[PDB]
Coordinates of C-alpha atoms and ligand atoms in Angstrom, one line a residue:
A1 CA 0.0 0.0 0.0
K2 CA 0.8 3.6 -0.4
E3 CA 1.0 4.7 3.3
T4 CA -2.3 6.5 4.1
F5 CA -2.7 10.2 5.1
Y6 CA -6.0 11.6 6.4
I7 CA -6.4 15.4 6.8
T8 CA -9.5 17.2 7.8
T9 CA -10.9 20.8 7.9
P10 CA -13.7 21.5 10.4
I11 CA -17.4 21.4 9.1
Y12 CA -18.5 25.0 8.3
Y13 CA -21.8 26.4 9.6
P14 CA -24.0 27.6 6.6
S15 CA -24.8 31.2 7.7
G16 CA -24.2 32.4 4.1
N17 CA -21.1 34.6 3.9
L18 CA -17.6 33.2 3.8
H19 CA -14.4 35.1 4.7
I20 CA -10.8 34.6 3.6
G21 CA -10.4 32.9 7.1
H22 CA -12.9 30.2 6.3
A23 CA -11.0 30.1 3.0
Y24 CA -7.7 29.9 4.9
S25 CA -8.6 26.5 6.4
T26 CA -9.6 24.8 3.2
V27 CA -6.7 26.3 1.2
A28 CA -4.1 25.2 3.9
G29 CA -5.7 21.7 4.2
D30 CA -5.4 21.6 0.4
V31 CA -1.7 22.6 0.6
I32 CA -1.1 19.8 3.1
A33 CA -3.1 17.3 0.9
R34 CA -1.3 18.3 -2.4
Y35 CA 2.0 18.0 -0.6
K36 CA 1.2 14.6 0.9
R37 CA 0.1 13.2 -2.4
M38 CA 3.4 14.5 -4.0
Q39 CA 5.3 12.7 -1.3
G40 CA 3.6 9.4 -2.3
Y41 CA 0.8 9.0 0.3
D42 CA -2.7 7.7 -0.2
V43 CA -4.5 11.0 0.7
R44 CA -8.0 11.5 1.9
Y45 CA -8.9 15.1 2.4
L46 CA -12.2 16.0 4.1
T47 CA -14.3 19.1 4.4
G48 CA -18.1 19.7 4.9
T49 CA -20.9 21.5 6.7
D50 CA -22.6 21.6 10.1
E51 CA -26.3 21.9 9.1
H52 CA -28.4 21.5 12.2
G53 CA -29.7 23.7 15.1
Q54 CA -32.1 26.5 16.0
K55 CA -30.3 29.1 13.9
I56 CA -30.8 27.1 10.6
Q57 CA -34.5 26.6 11.3
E58 CA -34.8 30.4 11.7
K59 CA -32.6 31.2 8.6
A60 CA -34.7 28.9 6.5
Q61 CA -37.9 30.4 7.7
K62 CA -36.9 34.0 7.1
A63 CA -35.7 33.1 3.6
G64 CA -39.1 31.4 3.4
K65 CA -37.7 27.9 2.7
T66 CA -37.6 24.5 4.3
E67 CA -34.4 23.7 6.1
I68 CA -33.1 21.4 3.4
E69 CA -34.1 23.8 0.6
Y70 CA -32.3 26.6 2.4
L71 CA -29.3 24.2 3.2
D72 CA -28.9 22.9 -0.3
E73 CA -28.5 26.5 -1.6
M74 CA -25.9 27.5 1.0
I75 CA -24.0 24.3 0.3
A76 CA -24.1 24.7 -3.5
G77 CA -22.4 28.1 -2.9
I78 CA -19.9 26.7 -0.5
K79 CA -18.8 23.9 -2.8
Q80 CA -18.6 26.5 -5.7
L81 CA -16.0 28.5 -3.7
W82 CA -13.9 25.4 -3.0
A83 CA -14.2 24.3 -6.7
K84 CA -13.0 27.8 -7.6
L85 CA -10.1 27.6 -5.2
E86 CA -9.3 24.2 -6.6
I87 CA -9.6 22.5 -3.1
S88 CA -8.6 18.8 -3.8
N89 CA -11.1 17.5 -1.1
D90 CA -11.9 13.9 -1.8
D91 CA -15.4 14.1 -0.1
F92 CA -17.8 16.7 1.5
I93 CA -19.7 15.6 4.6
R94 CA -23.1 17.1 5.3
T95 CA -24.5 16.6 8.7
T96 CA -27.9 16.2 7.1
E97 CA -26.6 13.0 5.4
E98 CA -28.0 9.6 6.5
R99 CA -24.4 8.4 6.8
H100 CA -23.8 11.1 9.4
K101 CA -27.2 11.1 11.2
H102 CA -26.9 7.2 11.6
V103 CA -23.5 7.5 13.3
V104 CA -24.9 10.4 15.6
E105 CA -27.8 8.2 16.6
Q106 CA -25.8 5.1 17.4
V107 CA -22.9 6.9 19.1
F108 CA -25.4 8.6 21.4
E109 CA -27.4 5.4 22.2
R110 CA -24.2 3.6 23.0
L111 CA -22.9 6.2 25.4
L112 CA -26.4 6.0 27.0
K113 CA -26.0 2.2 27.5
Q114 CA -22.5 2.4 28.8
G115 CA -23.7 5.1 31.3
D116 CA -21.4 7.8 30.0
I117 CA -24.3 10.0 29.1
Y118 CA -27.0 10.7 31.8
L119 CA -30.2 12.9 32.1
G120 CA -29.9 16.1 34.2
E121 CA -30.5 19.8 34.0
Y122 CA -28.4 22.5 32.3
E123 CA -28.5 26.0 33.9
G124 CA -27.0 29.0 32.1
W125 CA -27.0 32.6 31.0
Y126 CA -28.7 32.4 27.6
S127 CA -28.9 34.9 24.7
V128 CA -31.9 34.3 22.5
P129 CA -30.5 36.1 19.3
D130 CA -27.0 34.6 19.7
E131 CA -28.5 31.1 20.3
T132 CA -25.6 30.9 22.9
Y133 CA -25.0 30.4 26.6
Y134 CA -22.4 32.4 28.5
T135 CA -20.5 32.1 31.7
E136 CA -20.8 34.8 34.4
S137 CA -17.3 36.1 33.5
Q138 CA -18.1 36.2 29.8
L139 CA -20.9 38.7 30.5
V140 CA -20.6 42.4 29.5
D141 CA -22.1 45.0 31.8
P142 CA -23.0 42.4 34.4
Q143 CA -25.6 43.4 36.9
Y144 CA -25.0 42.5 40.6
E145 CA -27.4 42.6 43.5
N146 CA -25.8 42.3 47.0
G147 CA -22.8 40.5 45.4
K148 CA -24.7 38.0 43.3
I149 CA -25.0 38.1 39.5
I150 CA -28.5 38.8 38.4
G151 CA -28.3 39.7 34.7
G152 CA -26.0 41.1 32.0
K153 CA -25.3 41.3 28.3
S154 CA -24.0 39.1 25.6
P155 CA -20.3 40.0 24.7
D156 CA -21.2 39.2 21.1
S157 CA -24.4 41.2 20.3
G158 CA -24.9 43.0 23.5
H159 CA -28.5 41.5 23.9
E160 CA -29.6 41.1 27.5
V161 CA -29.0 37.5 28.8
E162 CA -31.6 35.4 30.8
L163 CA -31.1 32.5 33.2
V164 CA -32.3 29.3 31.7
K165 CA -32.8 26.0 33.4
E166 CA -33.4 23.1 30.9
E167 CA -33.3 19.4 30.7
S168 CA -30.1 18.0 29.1
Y169 CA -28.4 14.8 28.6
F170 CA -24.8 15.1 30.0
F171 CA -21.7 13.3 29.0
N172 CA -19.4 12.6 32.0
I173 CA -16.0 13.6 30.7
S174 CA -13.8 14.2 33.8
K175 CA -13.7 10.4 34.2
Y176 CA -11.3 10.4 31.3
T177 CA -9.2 13.3 32.6
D178 CA -6.1 11.2 33.6
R179 CA -6.1 9.2 30.4
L180 CA -6.2 12.4 28.3
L181 CA -3.3 13.8 30.3
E182 CA -1.5 10.5 29.8
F183 CA -2.3 10.6 26.1
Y184 CA -0.8 14.2 26.0
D185 CA 2.3 12.9 27.8
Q186 CA 2.8 10.0 25.3
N187 CA 1.9 12.2 22.3
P188 CA 3.9 15.5 22.8
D189 CA 3.4 16.8 19.3
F190 CA -0.5 16.3 19.7
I191 CA -1.5 19.9 20.0
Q192 CA -0.1 22.4 17.4
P193 CA 1.0 25.0 18.2
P194 CA 2.4 23.2 21.4
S195 CA 2.4 26.4 23.4
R196 CA -1.4 25.9 23.2
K197 CA -1.2 22.8 25.5
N198 CA -0.4 24.4 28.9
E199 CA -3.0 27.3 28.6
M200 CA -5.6 24.6 28.2
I201 CA -4.3 22.2 31.0
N202 CA -4.3 25.3 33.1
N203 CA -7.6 27.0 32.1
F204 CA -9.7 23.9 31.4
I205 CA -8.4 20.4 32.5
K206 CA -7.1 21.1 36.0
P207 CA -10.2 23.2 37.3
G208 CA -11.2 20.3 36.2
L209 CA -13.7 19.1 33.5
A210 CA -17.4 19.8 33.8
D211 CA -20.0 17.3 32.6
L212 CA -20.9 18.3 29.0
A213 CA -24.6 19.0 28.1
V214 CA -24.9 17.2 24.8
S215 CA -28.6 17.5 23.9
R216 CA -31.4 20.0 24.1
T217 CA -35.2 19.9 24.0
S218 CA -35.5 23.4 22.4
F219 CA -35.0 22.9 18.7
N220 CA -36.4 20.3 16.1
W221 CA -33.9 20.5 13.2
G222 CA -31.2 18.0 14.2
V223 CA -30.6 14.4 15.1
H224 CA -33.2 13.2 17.7
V225 CA -32.1 10.9 20.6
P226 CA -33.7 7.6 19.6
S227 CA -34.6 6.3 23.1
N228 CA -35.9 9.9 23.8
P229 CA -37.0 11.9 20.7
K230 CA -38.0 15.0 22.6
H231 CA -34.2 15.5 23.1
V232 CA -32.0 16.6 20.1
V233 CA -28.3 16.1 19.8
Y234 CA -26.5 19.4 20.5
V235 CA -23.3 20.6 18.7
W236 CA -20.6 18.6 20.4
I237 CA -21.3 15.0 19.3
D238 CA -23.2 16.0 16.1
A239 CA -20.3 18.1 14.7
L240 CA -17.3 16.0 16.0
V241 CA -18.3 12.6 14.5
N242 CA -18.3 14.2 11.0
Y243 CA -14.7 13.0 10.9
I244 CA -15.7 9.2 11.3
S245 CA -19.2 9.3 9.7
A246 CA -17.6 10.5 6.3
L247 CA -15.7 7.2 6.3
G248 CA -18.7 4.9 6.6
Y249 CA -18.1 4.1 10.2
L250 CA -21.1 2.0 11.5
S251 CA -22.4 1.5 8.0
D252 CA -22.4 -1.6 5.9
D253 CA -19.2 -0.5 4.2
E254 CA -16.6 0.7 6.7
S255 CA -13.6 0.2 4.3
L256 CA -12.7 3.9 4.2
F257 CA -12.9 4.0 8.1
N258 CA -10.7 0.9 8.4
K259 CA -8.3 2.4 5.9
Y260 CA -8.1 6.0 7.0
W261 CA -8.9 6.3 10.8
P262 CA -7.3 7.8 12.9
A263 CA -6.8 11.1 11.2
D264 CA -3.2 12.3 10.8
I265 CA -4.2 16.0 11.2
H266 CA -7.4 17.8 12.1
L267 CA -6.8 21.4 10.9
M268 CA -8.8 24.2 12.5
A269 CA -9.1 27.8 13.6
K270 CA -8.2 28.4 17.2
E271 CA -11.7 29.1 18.5
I272 CA -12.5 25.3 18.3
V273 CA -9.1 23.9 19.2
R274 CA -10.2 23.2 22.8
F275 CA -13.1 21.1 21.5
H276 CA -10.8 19.0 19.3
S277 CA -8.0 18.6 22.0
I278 CA -10.3 17.7 24.9
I279 CA -13.9 16.8 24.1
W280 CA -13.0 15.0 20.8
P281 CA -10.3 12.5 22.1
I282 CA -12.6 11.8 25.2
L283 CA -15.6 10.9 23.0
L284 CA -13.2 8.6 21.0
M285 CA -12.0 7.0 24.3
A286 CA -15.7 6.4 25.2
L287 CA -16.2 4.6 21.8
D288 CA -13.0 2.6 22.1
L289 CA -11.7 4.1 18.9
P290 CA -8.1 5.3 18.2
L291 CA -7.4 9.1 18.8
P292 CA -6.3 11.4 16.0
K293 CA -2.5 11.8 15.7
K294 CA -2.5 15.7 15.4
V295 CA -4.8 18.7 15.7
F296 CA -3.5 22.1 14.3
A297 CA -5.1 25.5 15.0
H298 CA -4.3 28.4 12.7
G299 CA -4.8 32.0 13.5
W300 CA -7.2 34.6 12.2
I301 CA -6.8 36.9 9.3
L302 CA -7.6 40.3 10.8
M303 CA -8.1 43.8 9.5
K304 CA -7.3 47.2 10.9
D305 CA -10.6 47.2 12.9
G306 CA -9.8 44.4 13.8
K307 CA -11.1 40.8 13.7
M308 CA -13.2 39.9 10.5
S309 CA -17.0 39.6 10.2
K310 CA -20.1 40.9 8.3
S311 CA -20.8 43.4 11.1
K312 CA -17.6 45.6 11.3
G313 CA -17.8 46.1 7.6
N314 CA -14.5 44.3 7.1
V315 CA -15.5 41.1 5.3
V316 CA -13.3 40.2 2.4
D317 CA -14.8 37.9 -0.3
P318 CA -12.2 35.4 -1.5
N319 CA -14.4 35.2 -4.7
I320 CA -13.8 38.8 -5.7
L321 CA -10.1 38.4 -4.9
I322 CA -9.8 35.5 -7.4
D323 CA -11.8 37.6 -9.9
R324 CA -10.0 40.9 -9.2
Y325 CA -6.5 39.5 -8.7
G326 CA -6.3 35.8 -9.9
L327 CA -6.4 32.4 -8.1
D328 CA -2.6 32.0 -7.6
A329 CA -2.4 35.5 -6.0
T330 CA -5.2 34.6 -3.6
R331 CA -3.9 31.2 -2.5
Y332 CA -0.4 32.8 -2.2
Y333 CA -1.4 35.7 0.0
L334 CA -3.3 33.5 2.4
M335 CA -0.5 31.0 2.9
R336 CA 2.3 33.5 2.8
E337 CA 0.8 36.0 5.3
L338 CA -0.2 33.7 8.2
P339 CA 2.6 32.5 10.3
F340 CA 2.5 29.4 12.5
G341 CA 1.3 30.5 16.0
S342 CA 0.2 34.1 14.9
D343 CA -2.6 36.0 13.4
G344 CA -2.1 37.8 10.0
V345 CA -3.6 40.8 8.4
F346 CA -5.5 41.7 5.2
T347 CA -4.9 45.0 3.7
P348 CA -5.7 45.5 0.0
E349 CA -2.4 47.3 -0.2
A350 CA -0.4 44.4 1.3
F351 CA -2.1 42.0 -1.1
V352 CA -1.2 43.9 -4.3
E353 CA 2.2 44.4 -3.0
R354 CA 2.8 40.7 -2.3
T355 CA 1.3 39.7 -5.6
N356 CA 3.3 42.3 -7.5
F357 CA 6.7 42.0 -5.9
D358 CA 6.8 38.2 -5.1
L359 CA 4.8 36.6 -7.9
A360 CA 4.8 39.0 -10.9
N361 CA 8.2 40.6 -10.4
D362 CA 10.5 38.0 -8.7
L363 CA 9.1 34.9 -10.1
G364 CA 7.2 36.1 -13.3
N365 CA 10.1 38.2 -14.5
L366 CA 12.7 35.6 -13.7
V367 CA 10.8 33.2 -16.0
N368 CA 10.4 35.9 -18.8
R369 CA 14.0 37.1 -18.6
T370 CA 15.2 33.5 -18.9
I371 CA 13.1 32.5 -21.9
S372 CA 13.8 35.8 -23.6
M373 CA 17.5 35.0 -23.4
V374 CA 17.3 31.4 -24.4
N375 CA 15.3 32.7 -27.5
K376 CA 17.8 35.6 -28.2
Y377 CA 21.0 33.6 -27.9
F378 CA 20.1 30.1 -29.0
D379 CA 16.8 30.7 -30.9
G380 CA 14.8 28.7 -28.4
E381 CA 17.1 25.7 -27.9
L382 CA 18.2 25.3 -24.3
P383 CA 21.5 23.5 -24.1
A384 CA 21.4 20.3 -22.0
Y385 CA 22.8 20.7 -18.5
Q386 CA 26.4 19.5 -18.0
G387 CA 27.9 20.3 -14.6
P388 CA 28.6 23.3 -12.3
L389 CA 30.8 25.1 -14.9
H390 CA 30.7 28.6 -13.5
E391 CA 32.5 29.8 -10.4
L392 CA 29.1 30.4 -8.7
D393 CA 27.4 27.1 -9.9
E394 CA 28.6 24.8 -7.1
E395 CA 27.3 26.8 -4.2
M396 CA 24.1 27.7 -6.2
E397 CA 23.4 24.0 -6.8
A398 CA 24.0 23.3 -3.1
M399 CA 21.5 26.2 -2.4
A400 CA 19.0 24.4 -4.5
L401 CA 19.3 21.2 -2.4
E402 CA 19.4 23.2 0.8
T403 CA 16.2 25.0 -0.4
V404 CA 14.4 21.6 -0.8
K405 CA 15.7 20.4 2.6
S406 CA 14.6 23.6 4.5
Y407 CA 11.2 23.7 2.6
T408 CA 10.5 20.1 3.6
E409 CA 11.4 20.8 7.3
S410 CA 9.0 23.8 7.2
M411 CA 6.2 21.7 5.5
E412 CA 6.4 19.0 8.2
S413 CA 6.4 21.5 11.1
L414 CA 3.4 23.2 9.5
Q415 CA 5.3 26.4 8.9
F416 CA 3.9 27.3 5.5
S417 CA 4.9 31.0 5.3
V418 CA 8.5 29.9 6.0
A419 CA 8.5 27.2 3.3
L420 CA 7.3 29.9 0.9
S421 CA 9.9 32.6 1.9
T422 CA 12.7 29.9 1.6
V423 CA 11.6 29.1 -2.0
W424 CA 11.6 33.0 -2.6
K425 CA 15.1 33.3 -1.2
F426 CA 16.1 30.9 -4.0
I427 CA 13.9 32.7 -6.6
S428 CA 15.6 36.0 -5.7
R429 CA 19.1 34.5 -5.8
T430 CA 18.4 33.1 -9.3
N431 CA 17.4 36.6 -10.5
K432 CA 20.8 37.7 -8.8
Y433 CA 22.5 35.0 -10.9
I434 CA 21.5 36.6 -14.2
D435 CA 23.0 40.0 -12.9
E436 CA 26.1 38.1 -11.9
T437 CA 26.6 36.0 -15.0
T438 CA 25.7 38.8 -17.4
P439 CA 24.8 36.4 -20.2
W440 CA 24.7 39.3 -22.8
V441 CA 28.4 39.8 -22.2
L442 CA 29.1 36.1 -22.8
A443 CA 26.8 36.2 -25.8
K444 CA 29.3 38.5 -27.5
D445 CA 32.2 36.2 -27.3
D446 CA 31.8 33.2 -29.6
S447 CA 34.3 31.2 -27.4
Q448 CA 31.8 31.5 -24.5
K449 CA 28.7 29.7 -25.9
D450 CA 29.4 26.7 -23.7
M451 CA 29.4 28.9 -20.5
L452 CA 26.4 30.8 -21.9
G453 CA 24.6 27.6 -22.1
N454 CA 25.7 26.5 -18.7
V455 CA 24.3 29.8 -17.3
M456 CA 21.0 29.2 -19.2
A457 CA 20.9 25.5 -18.0
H458 CA 21.1 26.7 -14.4
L459 CA 18.5 29.5 -14.6
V460 CA 16.0 26.9 -16.1
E461 CA 16.9 24.2 -13.6
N462 CA 16.5 26.7 -10.8
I463 CA 13.0 27.7 -12.2
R464 CA 12.1 24.0 -12.4
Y465 CA 13.0 23.4 -8.7
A466 CA 10.9 26.4 -7.7
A467 CA 7.8 25.3 -9.8
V468 CA 8.0 21.8 -8.2
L469 CA 8.1 23.2 -4.7
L470 CA 5.2 25.6 -5.4
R471 CA 2.9 22.9 -6.8
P472 CA 1.1 22.3 -3.4
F473 CA 0.5 26.1 -3.1
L474 CA -0.2 27.3 -6.6
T475 CA -2.2 25.3 -9.1
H476 CA -1.6 27.5 -12.1
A477 CA 1.9 29.0 -12.1
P478 CA 3.8 25.7 -11.9
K479 CA 2.0 24.1 -14.8
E480 CA 2.1 27.2 -17.0
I481 CA 5.9 27.5 -16.1
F482 CA 6.5 23.8 -17.3
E483 CA 4.6 24.4 -20.5
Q484 CA 6.4 27.7 -21.3
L485 CA 9.7 25.9 -20.7
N486 CA 8.5 22.8 -22.6
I487 CA 9.2 20.6 -19.6
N488 CA 6.7 18.0 -20.5
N489 CA 7.7 14.9 -18.7
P490 CA 5.5 14.4 -15.5
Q491 CA 8.5 12.9 -13.7
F492 CA 10.4 16.2 -14.0
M493 CA 7.5 17.8 -12.0
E494 CA 7.8 15.5 -9.0
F495 CA 9.8 15.8 -5.7
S496 CA 12.0 12.8 -6.5
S497 CA 13.3 14.8 -9.6
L498 CA 14.9 17.3 -7.2
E499 CA 17.3 14.8 -5.5
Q500 CA 20.0 15.5 -8.0
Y501 CA 20.6 19.0 -9.7
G502 CA 20.6 19.2 -13.5
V503 CA 17.9 16.8 -14.8
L504 CA 17.6 18.0 -18.5
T505 CA 20.3 15.9 -20.1
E506 CA 19.0 16.7 -23.6
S507 CA 18.2 19.9 -25.5
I508 CA 14.7 21.3 -25.3
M509 CA 12.8 24.0 -27.3
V510 CA 11.5 26.7 -24.8
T511 CA 8.4 28.6 -26.0
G512 CA 8.6 30.9 -29.0
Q513 CA 5.9 33.1 -27.4
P514 CA 6.3 33.6 -23.6
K515 CA 3.4 35.3 -21.8
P516 CA 3.3 36.6 -18.2
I517 CA 3.0 33.8 -15.5
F518 CA 0.7 36.3 -13.6
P519 CA -1.6 38.6 -15.5
Ligands
3BJ601 CL1 -15.9 20.1 13.3 C1 -16.6 21.2 14.5 C2 -17.1 22.4 14.1 C3 -17.6 23.3 15.0 C4 -17.6 23.0 16.4 N1 -18.0 23.8 17.4 C5 -19.2 24.5 17.3 N2 -19.8 24.7 16.1 C6 -21.0 25.4 16.2 N3 -21.7 25.7 15.1 C7 -23.0 26.3 15.1 C8 -23.9 25.2 15.5 N4 -25.0 25.2 16.3 C9 -25.6 24.0 16.4 C10 -26.7 23.5 17.0 C11 -27.0 22.1 16.9 C12 -26.2 21.2 16.2 C13 -25.1 21.7 15.5 C14 -24.8 23.1 15.6 N5 -23.8 23.9 15.1 N6 -21.4 25.9 17.3 C15 -20.7 25.8 18.5 N7 -21.2 26.4 19.6 C16 -20.5 26.2 20.8 C17 -21.2 26.9 22.0 O1 -21.8 28.1 21.5 C18 -22.9 27.9 20.6 C19 -22.4 27.2 19.4 N8 -19.6 25.1 18.5 C20 -17.1 21.8 16.8 CL2 -17.1 21.3 18.5 C21 -16.6 20.9 15.8
MG602 MG1 -40.3 18.3 22.0

C-alpha cells in the first residue's frame, strides 16, 4: 500500500457569507493534501458542513424555505468556492446525510447504554438572538445585587442574557481526565502549536472538566435521541463525529474508516481547538476508537478594525479576490501572510504588494528574462545541463538542495509562510545570478557559448525546482511554467526529480511566445 494520510478541515456552519479565514482553512488543508500526495501518500482530504440547530430553522424560515431547501442552496455556494479555489477535497460531509445522522444516533445510544451519558438539568446565561449560553465572567455590563450576579449582556451582540434551566443529557468527561493527560504525555506533538497545550491544561483540564450537556429539547432541526426523541443532539457529538461518519463508520461498508482512521491532522481555527483537544479524544475513548495523531489550530486573518466579520464592515470575499487579482495570487497571500502560531492581516495594499513583488516581479520576471534570453542567444534551444561550470554554480546547486531540505522541514512543522519565503530566497538568488553571470556579455564572445549555455541551463533548472516546490501552493503558475519551458515529462515535475541537480540531459525548445505567468 501507499501509506495513508488523512487530513480534515472543520465542518463549516452555513450562515451564508464566507471570509478569507474560512478560505484559509480549506486552502491550507489543500496545501497539506497536495503536498502529501506529491510525497507518495494515499491521501484522503475531508471538508463539509454543520447543518443542524435552531439558527438554521430560523434562517430557512426568514428566507421562506424549508431547512433542506435553504441548506442545499448554502452548500451549492460553499462547494462552488472550494471548486474555484481548486480545493482537492476527496469528499464533502453534510450533517444532514444519513451516513452522518446514523452515526450520531448510534454513538449517542451507546454512550447512554454504557452510562457515559445521563439525564440532568443544564443552567446557564442564555442569549436568544445569539442562540448561545455564556459564563458569568463572559458577560458584558454584568448586573449585581448584594454581590450576586442577576443579569448582564452578551459579549457578542450585547443583547440582554436570561437565566435558563433546561433538561439536558450530559456526557461525563472528567472520568477520562487522567487518560487524556497520559495521552498528551505519550503524544507531545499532539496539540499544534504546542504552546497551546499548557494554557488549556491550566484553564480547562485542571479546574477540572465539567459534565458536558450534549442534547437539548429546544429545537427540532437536528438528530433526535432515539430512546428519547424530545431530546435533540447538541453541537458537540453531532459536529465531531463528522470525521468518522464520512468514512462509513457503522455503516455496511466501513472500508474507508478501516483504511483512514485515525486522522493524521485535524486542521482548525483556534476558537475550536479546545473542543478537538479535549472533548474529541474523550468521546473517541468512550467509543474505544483510536485518537487522532495531530490537531492544528491556525490564527485569524484580521483587518485594521480588527477581527473579521459581516458586522464591522471588514468582510473580504475570496471570490472577488480570485476575480479581481487571480487564483494563484489569492492562494499565495493566504498561505504567505499567516505565520505558524500568529494571526495575520488583510490590507488590499499588502495584497497587491505581495502579488506584484513576489509573484509578478520576482518569479514572473525571472521566467520571462530566462526564456527571452534562451530565445535571443540560442533561438529557443536550451543546451542540456552538463555540470557546475561557472565559479558560482557549485554553491548555487548546493543552495537548490538546501532549499528543498529547508522547505520540507517547514512543511512538516506546518510552517507554511517559512516554506514559501525559503523558496523565494532561491527565486531572488536566481534573479541575482543573471546579474552576476551577465549572459549578454558572454553572448558577444563566440568562445563563451558553452558557458552561456551552462548559465542558461542553471536558470531553467532553478526555475524548475521552484515550480515543483510551489505545486502544493499554486495550481496555475507551476503548470504554466513547465509548458512555457516545454518541460513536458510528468517525472520532471515530482519531488524525487529534485534529489540531483541538473535533470535535462537533452536539448529542449522553450516557448517561441512567452506570456506573463501572472496577468
Ligand atoms: Cl468540526 C466542529 C465544528 C464546530 C464545532 N463547534 C461549534 N460549532 C458550532 N456551530 C454552530 C452550530 N449550532 C448547532 C446546534 C445544533 C447542532 C449543531 C450546531 N452547530 N457551534 C458551536 N457552539 C459552541 C457553543 O456556543 C454555541 C455554538 N460550536 C465543533 Cl465542537 C466541531
Ligand atoms: Mg419536543
